[model samples]
Target: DLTMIVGTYTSGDSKGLYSFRFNEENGTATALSEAEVENPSYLVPSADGKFIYAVSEFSNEQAAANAFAFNKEEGTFRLLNTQKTGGEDPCYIITNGSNVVTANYSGGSISVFPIDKDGSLLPASEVVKFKGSGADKERQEKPHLHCVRITPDGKYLFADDLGTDQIHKFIVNPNAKADNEDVFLKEGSPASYKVEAGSGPRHLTFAPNGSYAYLINELSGTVIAFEYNDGELKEIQTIAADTVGAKGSGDIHISPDGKFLYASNRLKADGLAIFSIHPENGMLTKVGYQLTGIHPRNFIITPNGKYLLVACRDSNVIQVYERDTDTGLLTDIRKDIKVDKPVCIKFVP
Candidate 1:
């Protein structure tokens, strides 16, 4: 059994964040609850399972975010607090302890906020602005920070700025002042890596052993592998998200066992590309593709590794699939739950 929260675009029938109670044993899903908020487009559960943090994809003029104290037993959300994201269209969020960081796409910045003990968001702690542009004039005219992630050891932070064709790295200062200031060091060795022009790196996932990292590019629809050593990333390999030239890559994640990797494609071909990870050198071998629903913005592997849930945005439903552990293939079970503009999915045990 698992409880899950879905973040969605509030343009259609979706009111805001919705909850579901799922039975993995029988491949069934039930919409348990929902809360009305504006455009809670992405969500992440707190490490302790007591709270949920989400970002809003509103206009840059009023980019806002919120936090909620959740009832795991009942699958409900209670409003804690909302705050300005200090940038526009905050698309992604990551939480570590009391600190929350948002990747603001249109504003080209990273906003940091402190989390109160009761789940309210404190005033903006810091907003670090970025500079530069990529090759794509329409999409990469300025810095567009798409995703933020921390190293396994919590020693470094990496932000993918798709508009800049770059991945920015920062050193974490655990002992930095508690005051509301941006204190992350941006000049760490191998400070940043520039991808090929128009690649538009969007999201990333790391291997279980922490020895490798795989980055999924949006415009290019490719996964680039890197050898990770003490916060330094060395590119090892690059494979097309779909070898047939499918772009519109969205999100990427590795299985719990780290035996395979999966990525979603949106417009070019709405589906998932499954790739096998080399156990020794951490390279990738394309396994195959599963034709999921349209506009698969995000998908995740279950904790037990028995299932994969896909959020098909434009299709207004979440697709459930039975995963093959030995071969890393997916079988569409046809047990889809209907929801409007389901952009993101987070699992709660």
Candidate 2:
């Protein structure tokens, strides 16, 4: 059994975070409970599995990062505390157990908050601002930070700036201090990895063994494979994901076995682009495409790699699909879990 937590946008019928009991054996999910929040667009579970951190993705009002005490057995969430993100529209969040970080899209900034011992959030300790633009005028007129992820080794953090078409790198400094105050992160040496202008890099995932990394670009609708070193990424290949030219690639994830890769796409076409991984070089070869409900934002593969669940935001449903571990194909089981504006899905054992 797996406890699946969903973060949703409250603009529709969704109240906030919703919980479900996922049966790995049958690839089905049953509703458990719901929690009220404004718009918890993204959620990240703590390394300790005792807490959940979510981003209040507000476009017009002040945005925030909230901490919650998660009762996995009871399928409940209790609000612990909230902290101003020092920016607006925090669309993505990540944690390294000691601190919570957010990528503020509209504000073009990154905010870092320290974590208290009891799973609550302390006030933001640092807020780093970014300034730049991409080739696309309408969507890249200003910097838009989309995702922040820590390296598997926990040595660095990478911030994907969609508007700038760059991934900013930062070194983790868990014990360092600035101006006599403890600081958790600092700008890395090279600063950033520059991709094609207007590509709009959105999300990134690493292979299970941490030997390679894959990034999905929103504007270009392509997936890029990278060779991962200690803290640097060397681009190896780029493959078209949204073949229909939707330019709305959203999320990327690799199967636990590291044999397959999947990316979610939306806008004009809604589906997942699947690829088989090369065991030696980490290159991707397109294998199949699975059409899905509207606006497939974030999806997850069961730890066992037997099932894939997709959160279709506009369709207001979480679709379940049986996975063929051998061919990396998905067969829609039609066991759709109804929810409102579900954007993110996560599983805790």
Candidate 3:
């Protein structure tokens, strides 16, 4: 069985968390009861399907990583306590079977923790702070780890650093393997997958077949294609998310069928870039832009491959789209779920 772990921002009170039903049948969604959680910007389930972890998106004198252990049967989340992220404003979280990694961009660091037996999170075993800056001094003063994602094969960990304009790769540890958690990347001296300067790499996703990867860069506001081999990320092509708007891109994802790629752009209040993936080479060729009708900061493809949803930040709405299975083309399903700055969402399958 699977449970959807949805994240939302509080309205006036600004301290509420909400989740919904991720139905695989009709590409339809139903928001469940709203539970108050402070800034749960990201949600990732453990490989065992026994736990759900959320990254609180703020930092203060007590700025640390906060997580929750949930019971699907009881439909409740237990406060599992907080762990030091070793950085501030931990925004994104990902797991490799048993271990969880959080990317602390504001604090310019990444925190790695062991997923405890009881579904709680152990304090970070290693907290790596990134250094170096590129184009925008005010924005990119230091290395900012934007996305901490795992390879589909579960062998390597990839961190897209916006400030450094680089994608850092690390070897995952085998002892932490879920079905078979394998350690990738050598410690300390990991190789960085390089891209053009000022290309702020924010989020990435693997192709369905796991042969290729796509990166939606925030700074440059572009999508990049790459060839994945072991722990290596070699760039293949770079295409603008919006040929005109350099203000940036939102979240990005490829389809489970490995047929298409999509990304949301937020400049003059919006559009989504559609691309078809070349199976053999994993190269991205642009498809016509879809007018989003709002500023989207996050978006996701329904697991059933029936609908595409966008979390429109500024205008505050979650818009839905029906996908064409044969061509992977998206059509506005036009179901708008109201929310306040709905920045991120995830599905359980």
Per residue, candidate 2 scores C-alpha lDDT tens digits across 309-335 of: 999999999999999989999999989
Considering TM-score, where higher is better, how would the candidates rank from best to worst? 2, 1, 3
Q: Assess every candidate by TM-score.
A: 0.96, 0.97, 0.91
lDDT of 3 at 185: 29
Clashes of each: 0, 0, 7
Candidate 3 ranges with C-alpha deviation above 4 Å: 1-3, 11-14, 24-27, 176-190
lDDT of 3 by residue, 205-303 (tens): 888887788899887888888888777777788888867755678788887787888888887648788888886788887865787857787888776
Q: What are the per-model C-alpha RMSD values against the true structure?
A: 1.6, 1.6, 3.0
Which digits, one per residue and each the tens of the lDDT, describe model 1 over residues 137-175?
A: 988999999999888888898999999988898887664
Ranking by lDDT: 2, 1, 3
Model 2: colliding residue pairs: none
Whole-model lDDT values for every prediction: 0.86, 0.90, 0.75
- The model with the greatest lDDT is 2
Task: Give lDDT for model 3.
Answer: 0.75
